[PDB]
Amino acid sequence: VTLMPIDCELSSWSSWTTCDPCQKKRYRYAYLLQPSQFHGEPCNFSDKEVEDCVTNRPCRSQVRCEGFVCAQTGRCVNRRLLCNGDNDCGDQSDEANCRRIYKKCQHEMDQYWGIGSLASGINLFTNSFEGPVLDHRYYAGGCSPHYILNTRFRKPYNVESYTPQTQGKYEFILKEYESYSDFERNVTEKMASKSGFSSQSDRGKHYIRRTKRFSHTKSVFLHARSDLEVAHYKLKPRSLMLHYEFLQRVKRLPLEYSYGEYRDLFRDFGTHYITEAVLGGIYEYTLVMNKEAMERGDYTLNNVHACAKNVGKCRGILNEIKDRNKRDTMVEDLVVLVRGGASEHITTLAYQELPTADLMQEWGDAVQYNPAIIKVKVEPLYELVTATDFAYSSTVRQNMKQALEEFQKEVSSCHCAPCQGNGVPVLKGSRCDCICPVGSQGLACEVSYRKNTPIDGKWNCWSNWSSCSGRRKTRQRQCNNPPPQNGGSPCSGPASETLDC
Amino acid sequence: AATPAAVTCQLSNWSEWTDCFPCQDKKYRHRSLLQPNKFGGTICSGDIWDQASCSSSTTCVRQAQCGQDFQCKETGRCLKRHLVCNGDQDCLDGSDEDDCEDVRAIDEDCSQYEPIPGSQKAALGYNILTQEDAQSVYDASYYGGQCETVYNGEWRELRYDSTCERLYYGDDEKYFRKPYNFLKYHFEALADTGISSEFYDNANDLLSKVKKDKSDSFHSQDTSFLNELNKYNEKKFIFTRIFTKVQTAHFKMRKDDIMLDEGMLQSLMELPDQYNYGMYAKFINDYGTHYITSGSMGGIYEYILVIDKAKMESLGITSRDITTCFHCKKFGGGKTERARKAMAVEDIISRVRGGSSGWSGGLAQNRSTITYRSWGRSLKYNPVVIDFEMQPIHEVLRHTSLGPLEAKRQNLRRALDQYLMEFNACRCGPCFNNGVPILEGTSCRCQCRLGSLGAACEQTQTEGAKADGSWSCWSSWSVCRAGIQERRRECDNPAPQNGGASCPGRKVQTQAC
Amino acid sequence: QLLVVENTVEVAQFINNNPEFLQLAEPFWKELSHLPSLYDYSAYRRLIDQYGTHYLQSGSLGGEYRVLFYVDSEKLKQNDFNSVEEKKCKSSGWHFVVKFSSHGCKELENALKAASGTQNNVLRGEPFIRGGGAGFISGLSYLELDNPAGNKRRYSAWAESVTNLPQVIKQKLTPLYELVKEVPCASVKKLYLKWALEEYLDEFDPCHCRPCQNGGLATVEGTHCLCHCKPYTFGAACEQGVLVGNQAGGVDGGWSCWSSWSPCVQGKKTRSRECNNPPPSGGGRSCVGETTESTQCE
Amino acid sequence: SSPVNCQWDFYAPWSECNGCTKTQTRRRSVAVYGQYGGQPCVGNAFETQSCEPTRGCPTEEGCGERFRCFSGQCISKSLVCNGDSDCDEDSADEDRCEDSERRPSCDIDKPPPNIELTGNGYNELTGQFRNRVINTKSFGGQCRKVFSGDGKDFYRLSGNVLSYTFQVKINNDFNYE
């Protein structure tokens, strides 16, 4: 009816880019023009073609390795790392055929809990962890033991420190309001008349005007938030050891710019890597409840009657009304968010009641072993493209810059048509999901019983850069004009941006 | 309401059997399902696909699907040579390991770690029409020489040693080995609970009355008049929705050089490059229509309660009543009016996905902090794919390590575009009153709400019959206009009942011929 | 209103050696090595960003615990009743012209009731902890409304756990340029780092931030100033809500940014600030510090 | 109250030209800091040029007689094959050295429970602890055990630290009104 399925449209293919001298391949791609929404046709997967080429062009991809070139993986490990007892290559290709193995450390050592999670790239726009980009199981030498409690851990070479800067911060707020008003009026009257002589004349009257007018309201806002920080993590600034899969995939990138191939890079590994993080858990609880009661009562009666006796004639009227109305309403919204820890505690914290201090203790204990990543400072993944292990490193870097800039545009949810019901459209891929708040339901959040639903305004996509002499972008707010249904908070961010060409 | 006709199941005659495929050596034929028994009636008492034994006219396909790559024996899988003698069996035969004098790699920092529990569950195919999981599409077990490990964040298992009196956490299961077919398996733990509860009540009560008399005596005689309107109205609405989903791990499948399941590899090589719908429909049947490319392991709890009651009463009366007496004569007459409309609807859904049968059932029956905790405890051991992104089963062909298979991909695409509509629940007819048509492969039923059923969820005591429509099945493709083609559908199976929601999607669709 | 202000220290101190005998961390020394040997403030700022402005010459490890808990509730009930009742009844009759009678008796009532009641019940609490086990932190910082300071046992246990995961709760600081060592041009990089420290303290000086009301501490966060409102005050300036606890009142004076160095004329640089940001008002205290500095030329 | 949009200053003159990297940087001051939710300044404060240097890149002076860690830090040759990692990151002093040469240099290696935190830098404006600056586990070949009476455990101090001690102080203000 109102929502109508929107089919995915993707661009006409780009031109075939010229055959890459090193990849001996040629590439074309389609932009996604609009995502599928409301169960519209999901177009098709594979918005990118790669073709074989014959190329005379020379390729200088033979980046020198003074070290040991791993047989299967081709990682260039330092010659000193052979026969140290660590698999610094893949498939022990550095430890194979060792006359003797000089075990760099004899003690059992753990890896820091969850450390490999941080070696994944992060899609900063989606804010989603993706494929592995750094090798946090490469130690080089290492074997300086780090004790946290009794457990001694072996720090990865990539990691500048992981350290238990343990902290926690609980915020509780409970604001209850009540109002009632309760009015009554009881007007009442009688009249009586008699006369006589031989005659009689009796005239009685009654009147009632009774009114009741009651209104009670109760409101509760109850917000609780535990922020628990259990460790702090920083990646080294320099000379990082990349993951095999990422190394390869980057080596596959063409030197001539081809957006689709870099886009596939970002969709596999994301856009950024975590250079520093705070690891912890978040528990947040927020209960909003409003209750109103209203009663209306309005009774009226009249009697008007007479009789005269001389023979007798009597006359009379009764009139009555009882108008009674009783509007009553409750609206209760509870959202619980829990991040980090064990499933058991995550779930029972996700119950609708506030927890016991016992359960908060158990949860925070578990969070130490399976922490969420509370805060990250991230650098774009092109900063990992370095001359040390890629040929044409500057070219690949620049192409990643350009592809990142375009990727940010393409992946922006703003392409999505506005959700009803103060839905939040999220671009899952070729397809956009309306996340419906509590009290909103269905594909567009169209099904909501709530009488009013304040629509916080959603920016439209930033209009393309204007030309130089004040290169500028503007936004219109048109996409979800807030005012309907009593719009809520207008968009905080910049409505327009200016840049010096 | 009235039942439809319990029309019998009806099939096409058998198609003529294909030749005895050189390896399977089996005569394949199909009979298309023209119409399933819409409800009850004469079922089709047989298969739709049949496969008679034979003896082949010629040699099985060349037992040499690849050069230099080591080919296993029962399975056509081609292994890059470093996978031979790597200390783990890269194919069902073990032919890569079971004759090695020594192993080129030992992987003594992975081979202790079991595969990620539940990884096999993400590898299943998926039958969109049934929502059943199908046979393994991906290889849940092949590691491809990768030694990749996933930190098991919930490793921390409590142990007690009576001798030491030490109560401590056993360090077993600390890491799991990631199968090669996963690009990521993230193990991030999240919960979100959103709850909305809404209550609305109204009454509007309005008694209104007059009474009147005039009476005279010299005989004594009376006339009295009465007029009244008594009206009563009530509305009572309760809605509450509880949705608590608990992610325990995100995963993303590898989209490049997918290693298909060896059973799937068999079933796929065995497929002829000719559109014998019977075979292709069998492949879509047992591997299903779709395979998962991404998703989340976890649990979901959804509980919805809707109660709606309305009661309207209007009572009118007029009368005139008279006396004459001095013995007595007494008279009267009038009009009585009553009109009523009353409807009550109560509808509760409590569905729990993931977590053990017993403890998920306990949370399904009785929501409490005890059942939330025991359910979450059971989610550690038995998570489920709670959300996923999937592609049509033919789409894996383009991405499998076998390389191009385009004839078979096109044939399977066509077979799927057929199957999706031949076996579609649209053909189970008009389940009234929000009844849910399901086609159990050959027999239809309407899963009804909590009320009476005789044929089509019609007998339900729901005279407040406000219930949503559903589409008739898509009409057959138009005789295309030499390049463009159209399909038509109507919101008439059932029609939207007495103001129920019109069917949401397309009333007409169009296709390039 | 509760305040809990609470420390356990249990590494009474550490004292780091002087910069001569300190061993630099390998990545820090690597970043010093890559400093450009020239005043490229971009590089030194990236250094001060990653490693900060100082290192801990000495300090004590421990844990901090604070609870601010505030309960404020008011209940008001107003109830009025009025009633008016009147009768006027008279009879007049005659017997000496024509036997006659007349009677009339008239009644009115008019009752009225009006009741109103309002409650507000606001409760706020912010337990904060550093140090100790994450589980003891979350158990203790979870506000128990019947015992908002936290029960004895749980504080016991946390104060034990902070033995094992103590945090630096008190420190004495040495400028980071003192560690510039073991590197090419170390002597020169040490001066350029000192100049970078002064440039950075300039760039992030809260002087740039025009005042927050209600004593909100303005801090430069990159290019822009947040106001960190004091408890239960909020808004862009902290213009809204009310301070809990006791305040001396007025507006405290804040320093303007230092004027630029006079170029060491006669070998003395001099620079001035004005304490106009804001001018101390309403009996608020003067800004604290000297109006001017002088230094030897570099 | 009123926001104030951040305005960038003009770019400063370029830096002198780096011999090591053949580049210069400019800086923009923030002419007017954004306040009260005024839009922050957008883009980088710095821009960089390729440039022809006047300066040579100063070389490393190698370790001379001392042992050279793989990072290029230098340590006393007496520390090689201590059985202790004295090359901070790479432990290159312990590479490929005999099971006879590595001594029982100390019976315990467990540093005090968070002595790593004593080596962090500190940012005095933001009040935040920053990243690792001092190697607080350089044992210098000493077996400098200390018994913590608090933790009731033996810990090995670094060779440098002037003191590390475990006497507790507990300092409680309650104030209820």
Ligand SMILES: *[C@@H]1O[C@H](CO)[C@@H](O[C@@H]2O[C@H](CO)[C@@H](O)[C@H](O)[C@H]2NC(C)=O)[C@H](O)[C@H]1NC(C)=O
């Ligand atoms: C207006 O009239 C109503 C109806 O008579 C009054 O309600 C009665 O009050 C008495 C005294 O409190 C009770 O004993 C009765 O049970 C009440 N009746 C009902 C139906 O509730 C009401 O008090 C009057 N209001 C005012 C302000 O005088």
Ligand SMILES: *[C@@H]1O[C@H](CO)[C@@H](O)[C@H](O)[C@H]1NC(C)=O
């Ligand atoms: C649900 O559990 C509670 C507590 O055990 C019990 O009182 C209640 O009767 C149960 N209800 C059902 C339907 O099981």
Ligand SMILES: [Ca+2]
């Ligand atoms: Ca090695």
Ligand SMILES: [Ca+2]
């Ligand atoms: Ca093998």
